[PDB]
Amino acid sequence: MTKQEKTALNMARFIRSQTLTLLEKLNELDADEQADICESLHDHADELYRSCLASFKKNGQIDEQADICESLHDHADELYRSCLARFGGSKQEKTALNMARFIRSQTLTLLEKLNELAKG
Ligand SMILES: [Zn+2]
């Protein structure tokens, strides 16, 4: 596996955990809709990672992974969007929001590094 691939792999796994850490915080606020969205988000992160391991162990010939990540970014964005439309203004809520945004960003750059990888 190359440094490129590894970084991209190391970014995917990181997202699998973050979706879990934020899922926790989301449950405490009883933000049921958001918690539900984060789940699909987490489920997409599980498929994306697995798919990348498969490729990076054979050959970094990624293609579907890029497609997935796109769907992962959509959720991370949707998640952020919904949180930005229903949260009050407390500390607890402030954190769950910035983490949501943080994820959105991490999924953006992931998608980038994956695309720059599908073109060789
Ligand atoms: Zn999972």
mmCIF file of all heavy atoms in Angstrom, residues 87-120:
data_model
loop_
_atom_site.group_PDB
_atom_site.id
_atom_site.type_symbol
_atom_site.label_atom_id
_atom_site.label_comp_id
_atom_site.label_asym_id
_atom_site.label_seq_id
_atom_site.Cartn_x
_atom_site.Cartn_y
_atom_site.Cartn_z
ATOM 1 N N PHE A 87 -31.167 23.309 16.083
ATOM 2 C CA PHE A 87 -30.543 23.477 17.396
ATOM 3 C C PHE A 87 -30.757 24.825 18.078
ATOM 4 O O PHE A 87 -30.793 25.872 17.425
ATOM 5 C CB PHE A 87 -29.035 23.200 17.322
ATOM 6 C CG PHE A 87 -28.680 21.744 17.252
ATOM 7 C CD1 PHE A 87 -29.639 20.787 16.943
ATOM 8 C CD2 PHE A 87 -27.375 21.333 17.475
ATOM 9 C CE1 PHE A 87 -29.305 19.441 16.853
ATOM 10 C CE2 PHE A 87 -27.025 19.994 17.390
ATOM 11 C CZ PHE A 87 -27.992 19.041 17.078
ATOM 12 N N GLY A 88 -30.900 24.774 19.404
ATOM 13 C CA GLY A 88 -31.077 25.973 20.196
ATOM 14 C C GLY A 88 -29.733 26.673 20.226
ATOM 15 O O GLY A 88 -29.129 26.863 19.180
ATOM 16 N N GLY A 89 -29.244 27.043 21.403
ATOM 17 C CA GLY A 89 -27.959 27.716 21.467
ATOM 18 C C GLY A 89 -27.146 27.411 22.709
ATOM 19 O O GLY A 89 -26.589 28.322 23.316
ATOM 20 N N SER A 90 -27.066 26.142 23.096
ATOM 21 C CA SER A 90 -26.305 25.793 24.281
ATOM 22 C C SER A 90 -24.968 25.166 23.927
ATOM 23 O O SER A 90 -24.732 24.778 22.778
ATOM 24 C CB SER A 90 -27.096 24.838 25.175
ATOM 25 O OG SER A 90 -27.217 23.552 24.596
ATOM 26 N N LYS A 91 -24.105 25.075 24.938
ATOM 27 C CA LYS A 91 -22.768 24.514 24.800
ATOM 28 C C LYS A 91 -22.845 23.131 24.203
ATOM 29 O O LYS A 91 -22.219 22.853 23.186
ATOM 30 C CB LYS A 91 -22.084 24.444 26.170
ATOM 31 C CG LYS A 91 -20.743 25.175 26.252
ATOM 32 C CD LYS A 91 -20.879 26.663 25.941
ATOM 33 C CE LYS A 91 -19.529 27.372 25.908
ATOM 34 N NZ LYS A 91 -18.880 27.377 27.239
ATOM 35 N N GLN A 92 -23.614 22.263 24.849
ATOM 36 C CA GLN A 92 -23.788 20.890 24.391
ATOM 37 C C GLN A 92 -24.125 20.886 22.900
ATOM 38 O O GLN A 92 -23.517 20.167 22.115
ATOM 39 C CB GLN A 92 -24.913 20.211 25.180
ATOM 40 C CG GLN A 92 -24.759 20.255 26.719
ATOM 41 C CD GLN A 92 -24.950 21.660 27.337
ATOM 42 O OE1 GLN A 92 -25.998 22.299 27.179
ATOM 43 N NE2 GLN A 92 -23.933 22.128 28.056
ATOM 44 N N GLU A 93 -25.089 21.711 22.515
ATOM 45 C CA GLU A 93 -25.499 21.802 21.125
ATOM 46 C C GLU A 93 -24.398 22.388 20.248
ATOM 47 O O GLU A 93 -24.208 21.942 19.124
ATOM 48 C CB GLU A 93 -26.794 22.626 21.014
ATOM 49 C CG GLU A 93 -28.019 21.900 21.597
ATOM 50 C CD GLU A 93 -29.322 22.701 21.540
ATOM 51 O OE1 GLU A 93 -29.439 23.745 22.226
ATOM 52 O OE2 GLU A 93 -30.241 22.278 20.811
ATOM 53 N N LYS A 94 -23.669 23.379 20.762
ATOM 54 C CA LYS A 94 -22.586 24.006 20.003
ATOM 55 C C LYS A 94 -21.541 23.000 19.545
ATOM 56 O O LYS A 94 -21.082 23.060 18.403
ATOM 57 C CB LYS A 94 -21.896 25.080 20.834
ATOM 58 C CG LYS A 94 -22.735 26.305 21.085
ATOM 59 C CD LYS A 94 -23.065 27.015 19.803
ATOM 60 C CE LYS A 94 -23.934 28.225 20.071
ATOM 61 N NZ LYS A 94 -24.341 28.895 18.797
ATOM 62 N N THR A 95 -21.163 22.091 20.445
ATOM 63 C CA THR A 95 -20.182 21.052 20.148
ATOM 64 C C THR A 95 -20.671 20.093 19.064
ATOM 65 O O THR A 95 -19.997 19.885 18.064
ATOM 66 C CB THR A 95 -19.835 20.231 21.416
ATOM 67 O OG1 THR A 95 -19.068 21.038 22.309
ATOM 68 C CG2 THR A 95 -19.030 19.004 21.061
ATOM 69 N N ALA A 96 -21.843 19.506 19.269
ATOM 70 C CA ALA A 96 -22.411 18.575 18.307
ATOM 71 C C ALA A 96 -22.503 19.203 16.937
ATOM 72 O O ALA A 96 -22.515 18.503 15.934
ATOM 73 C CB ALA A 96 -23.789 18.125 18.755
ATOM 74 N N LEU A 97 -22.560 20.526 16.884
ATOM 75 C CA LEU A 97 -22.667 21.202 15.600
ATOM 76 C C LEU A 97 -21.316 21.333 14.904
ATOM 77 O O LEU A 97 -21.186 21.053 13.709
ATOM 78 C CB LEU A 97 -23.285 22.589 15.767
ATOM 79 C CG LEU A 97 -23.730 23.156 14.420
ATOM 80 C CD1 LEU A 97 -25.217 22.933 14.269
ATOM 81 C CD2 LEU A 97 -23.362 24.631 14.308
ATOM 82 N N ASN A 98 -20.309 21.767 15.649
ATOM 83 C CA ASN A 98 -18.984 21.925 15.076
ATOM 84 C C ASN A 98 -18.363 20.577 14.714
ATOM 85 O O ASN A 98 -17.552 20.489 13.791
ATOM 86 C CB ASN A 98 -18.073 22.707 16.036
ATOM 87 C CG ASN A 98 -18.040 22.116 17.442
ATOM 88 O OD1 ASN A 98 -17.574 20.986 17.655
ATOM 89 N ND2 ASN A 98 -18.535 22.884 18.412
ATOM 90 N N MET A 99 -18.751 19.524 15.428
ATOM 91 C CA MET A 99 -18.204 18.206 15.135
ATOM 92 C C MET A 99 -18.823 17.760 13.829
ATOM 93 O O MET A 99 -18.164 17.139 12.999
ATOM 94 C CB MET A 99 -18.547 17.206 16.243
ATOM 95 C CG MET A 99 -17.682 15.936 16.227
ATOM 96 S SD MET A 99 -18.016 14.763 17.583
ATOM 97 C CE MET A 99 -17.885 15.838 19.013
ATOM 98 N N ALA A 100 -20.101 18.100 13.670
ATOM 99 C CA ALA A 100 -20.873 17.776 12.478
ATOM 100 C C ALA A 100 -20.226 18.451 11.279
ATOM 101 O O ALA A 100 -20.089 17.850 10.213
ATOM 102 C CB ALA A 100 -22.310 18.260 12.641
ATOM 103 N N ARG A 101 -19.831 19.706 11.464
ATOM 104 C CA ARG A 101 -19.176 20.476 10.414
ATOM 105 C C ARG A 101 -17.784 19.896 10.164
ATOM 106 O O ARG A 101 -17.342 19.745 9.027
ATOM 107 C CB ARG A 101 -19.085 21.949 10.843
ATOM 108 C CG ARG A 101 -18.133 22.816 10.026
ATOM 109 C CD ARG A 101 -18.397 24.299 10.255
ATOM 110 N NE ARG A 101 -18.663 24.601 11.659
ATOM 111 C CZ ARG A 101 -17.772 24.490 12.642
ATOM 112 N NH1 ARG A 101 -16.533 24.083 12.378
ATOM 113 N NH2 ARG A 101 -18.124 24.775 13.894
ATOM 114 N N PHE A 102 -17.094 19.560 11.237
ATOM 115 C CA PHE A 102 -15.771 18.996 11.100
ATOM 116 C C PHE A 102 -15.820 17.764 10.192
ATOM 117 O O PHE A 102 -14.996 17.602 9.289
ATOM 118 C CB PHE A 102 -15.227 18.634 12.480
ATOM 119 C CG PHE A 102 -13.920 17.927 12.436
ATOM 120 C CD1 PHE A 102 -12.737 18.643 12.285
ATOM 121 C CD2 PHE A 102 -13.865 16.536 12.511
ATOM 122 C CE1 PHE A 102 -11.512 17.983 12.207
ATOM 123 C CE2 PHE A 102 -12.648 15.867 12.434
ATOM 124 C CZ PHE A 102 -11.468 16.593 12.281
ATOM 125 N N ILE A 103 -16.797 16.902 10.443
ATOM 126 C CA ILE A 103 -16.974 15.695 9.661
ATOM 127 C C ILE A 103 -17.201 16.037 8.201
ATOM 128 O O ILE A 103 -16.558 15.480 7.308
ATOM 129 C CB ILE A 103 -18.170 14.869 10.187
ATOM 130 C CG1 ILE A 103 -17.825 14.271 11.559
ATOM 131 C CG2 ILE A 103 -18.528 13.757 9.197
ATOM 132 C CD1 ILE A 103 -16.568 13.420 11.560
ATOM 133 N N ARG A 104 -18.118 16.962 7.962
ATOM 134 C CA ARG A 104 -18.428 17.378 6.605
ATOM 135 C C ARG A 104 -17.134 17.720 5.868
ATOM 136 O O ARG A 104 -16.938 17.320 4.721
ATOM 137 C CB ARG A 104 -19.381 18.579 6.632
ATOM 138 C CG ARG A 104 -20.002 18.926 5.284
ATOM 139 C CD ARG A 104 -21.267 19.768 5.453
ATOM 140 N NE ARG A 104 -21.145 21.148 4.975
ATOM 141 C CZ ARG A 104 -20.240 22.022 5.407
ATOM 142 N NH1 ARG A 104 -19.354 21.675 6.336
ATOM 143 N NH2 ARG A 104 -20.222 23.252 4.912
ATOM 144 N N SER A 105 -16.238 18.436 6.537
ATOM 145 C CA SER A 105 -14.968 18.820 5.924
ATOM 146 C C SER A 105 -14.062 17.630 5.671
ATOM 147 O O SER A 105 -13.486 17.490 4.589
ATOM 148 C CB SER A 105 -14.244 19.829 6.807
ATOM 149 O OG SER A 105 -14.999 21.025 6.903
ATOM 150 N N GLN A 106 -13.941 16.769 6.672
ATOM 151 C CA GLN A 106 -13.102 15.599 6.540
ATOM 152 C C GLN A 106 -13.581 14.680 5.414
ATOM 153 O O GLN A 106 -12.772 14.010 4.770
ATOM 154 C CB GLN A 106 -13.034 14.846 7.872
ATOM 155 C CG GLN A 106 -11.605 14.653 8.368
ATOM 156 C CD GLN A 106 -10.866 15.976 8.534
ATOM 157 O OE1 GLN A 106 -10.911 16.851 7.660
ATOM 158 N NE2 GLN A 106 -10.174 16.124 9.657
ATOM 159 N N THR A 107 -14.890 14.657 5.170
ATOM 160 C CA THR A 107 -15.442 13.829 4.102
ATOM 161 C C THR A 107 -15.227 14.507 2.762
ATOM 162 O O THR A 107 -15.242 13.858 1.724
ATOM 163 C CB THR A 107 -16.954 13.578 4.277
ATOM 164 O OG1 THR A 107 -17.604 14.801 4.623
ATOM 165 C CG2 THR A 107 -17.209 12.550 5.347
ATOM 166 N N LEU A 108 -15.032 15.819 2.779
ATOM 167 C CA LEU A 108 -14.806 16.551 1.538
ATOM 168 C C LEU A 108 -13.402 16.264 1.023
ATOM 169 O O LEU A 108 -13.202 15.898 -0.138
ATOM 170 C CB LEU A 108 -14.971 18.061 1.758
ATOM 171 C CG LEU A 108 -14.830 18.954 0.515
ATOM 172 C CD1 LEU A 108 -15.712 18.451 -0.610
ATOM 173 C CD2 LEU A 108 -15.193 20.381 0.869
ATOM 174 N N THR A 109 -12.427 16.427 1.904
ATOM 175 C CA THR A 109 -11.050 16.190 1.531
ATOM 176 C C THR A 109 -10.816 14.726 1.211
ATOM 177 O O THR A 109 -9.955 14.408 0.389
ATOM 178 C CB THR A 109 -10.091 16.649 2.643
ATOM 179 O OG1 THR A 109 -10.698 16.419 3.919
ATOM 180 C CG2 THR A 109 -9.769 18.136 2.477
ATOM 181 N N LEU A 110 -11.581 13.839 1.846
ATOM 182 C CA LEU A 110 -11.431 12.412 1.587
ATOM 183 C C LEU A 110 -11.784 12.168 0.142
ATOM 184 O O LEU A 110 -11.026 11.541 -0.598
ATOM 185 C CB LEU A 110 -12.359 11.588 2.472
ATOM 186 C CG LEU A 110 -12.247 10.061 2.301
ATOM 187 C CD1 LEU A 110 -10.782 9.624 2.424
ATOM 188 C CD2 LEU A 110 -13.123 9.360 3.344
ATOM 189 N N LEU A 111 -12.947 12.685 -0.239
ATOM 190 C CA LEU A 111 -13.467 12.581 -1.594
ATOM 191 C C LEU A 111 -12.419 13.108 -2.579
ATOM 192 O O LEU A 111 -12.178 12.512 -3.632
ATOM 193 C CB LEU A 111 -14.757 13.398 -1.707
ATOM 194 C CG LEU A 111 -15.549 13.353 -3.011
ATOM 195 C CD1 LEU A 111 -16.310 12.054 -3.096
ATOM 196 C CD2 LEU A 111 -16.512 14.512 -3.057
ATOM 197 N N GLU A 112 -11.797 14.228 -2.230
ATOM 198 C CA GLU A 112 -10.765 14.800 -3.085
ATOM 199 C C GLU A 112 -9.619 13.808 -3.260
ATOM 200 O O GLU A 112 -9.288 13.420 -4.380
ATOM 201 C CB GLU A 112 -10.219 16.097 -2.486
ATOM 202 C CG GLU A 112 -10.874 17.352 -3.008
ATOM 203 C CD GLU A 112 -11.200 18.343 -1.900
ATOM 204 O OE1 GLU A 112 -10.337 18.578 -1.028
ATOM 205 O OE2 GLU A 112 -12.319 18.893 -1.902
ATOM 206 N N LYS A 113 -9.021 13.391 -2.151
ATOM 207 C CA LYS A 113 -7.913 12.462 -2.234
ATOM 208 C C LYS A 113 -8.278 11.162 -2.950
ATOM 209 O O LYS A 113 -7.410 10.506 -3.536
ATOM 210 C CB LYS A 113 -7.348 12.203 -0.838
ATOM 211 C CG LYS A 113 -6.891 13.501 -0.204
ATOM 212 C CD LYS A 113 -5.753 13.323 0.771
ATOM 213 C CE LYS A 113 -5.238 14.691 1.255
ATOM 214 N NZ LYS A 113 -4.855 15.644 0.150
ATOM 215 N N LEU A 114 -9.556 10.797 -2.932
ATOM 216 C CA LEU A 114 -9.965 9.588 -3.619
ATOM 217 C C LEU A 114 -10.042 9.814 -5.128
ATOM 218 O O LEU A 114 -9.639 8.950 -5.913
ATOM 219 C CB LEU A 114 -11.311 9.094 -3.092
ATOM 220 C CG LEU A 114 -11.233 8.302 -1.785
ATOM 221 C CD1 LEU A 114 -12.559 7.600 -1.544
ATOM 222 C CD2 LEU A 114 -10.111 7.278 -1.854
ATOM 223 N N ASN A 115 -10.557 10.972 -5.533
ATOM 224 C CA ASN A 115 -10.668 11.307 -6.952
ATOM 225 C C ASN A 115 -9.285 11.442 -7.581
ATOM 226 O O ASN A 115 -9.023 10.925 -8.668
ATOM 227 C CB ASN A 115 -11.430 12.622 -7.135
ATOM 228 C CG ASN A 115 -12.937 12.438 -7.102
ATOM 229 O OD1 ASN A 115 -13.481 11.603 -7.813
ATOM 230 N ND2 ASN A 115 -13.619 13.232 -6.284
ATOM 231 N N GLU A 116 -8.404 12.153 -6.892
ATOM 232 C CA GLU A 116 -7.049 12.350 -7.373
ATOM 233 C C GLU A 116 -6.341 10.992 -7.438
ATOM 234 O O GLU A 116 -5.219 10.890 -7.944
ATOM 235 C CB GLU A 116 -6.294 13.313 -6.442
ATOM 236 C CG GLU A 116 -6.631 14.830 -6.596
ATOM 237 C CD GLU A 116 -8.089 15.225 -6.260
ATOM 238 O OE1 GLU A 116 -8.981 15.123 -7.135
ATOM 239 O OE2 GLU A 116 -8.346 15.648 -5.113
ATOM 240 N N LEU A 117 -7.010 9.951 -6.933
ATOM 241 C CA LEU A 117 -6.466 8.587 -6.931
ATOM 242 C C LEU A 117 -7.083 7.684 -7.992
ATOM 243 O O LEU A 117 -6.477 6.692 -8.391
ATOM 244 C CB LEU A 117 -6.650 7.924 -5.565
ATOM 245 C CG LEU A 117 -5.697 8.341 -4.446
ATOM 246 C CD1 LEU A 117 -6.059 7.578 -3.183
ATOM 247 C CD2 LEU A 117 -4.257 8.067 -4.854
ATOM 248 N N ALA A 118 -8.289 8.022 -8.439
ATOM 249 C CA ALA A 118 -8.977 7.246 -9.466
ATOM 250 C C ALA A 118 -8.399 7.578 -10.845
ATOM 251 O O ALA A 118 -8.563 6.812 -11.801
ATOM 252 C CB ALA A 118 -10.473 7.539 -9.431
ATOM 253 N N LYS A 119 -7.741 8.732 -10.939
ATOM 254 C CA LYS A 119 -7.105 9.171 -12.182
ATOM 255 C C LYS A 119 -5.629 8.789 -12.082
ATOM 256 O O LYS A 119 -4.743 9.552 -12.486
ATOM 257 C CB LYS A 119 -7.218 10.696 -12.356
ATOM 258 C CG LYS A 119 -8.505 11.199 -12.992
ATOM 259 C CD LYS A 119 -8.665 12.698 -12.749
ATOM 260 C CE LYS A 119 -9.946 13.252 -13.375
ATOM 261 N NZ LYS A 119 -11.193 12.599 -12.876
ATOM 262 N N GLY A 120 -5.377 7.604 -11.538
ATOM 263 C CA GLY A 120 -4.018 7.131 -11.364
ATOM 264 C C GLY A 120 -3.454 7.703 -10.076
ATOM 265 O O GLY A 120 -3.545 7.018 -9.025
#
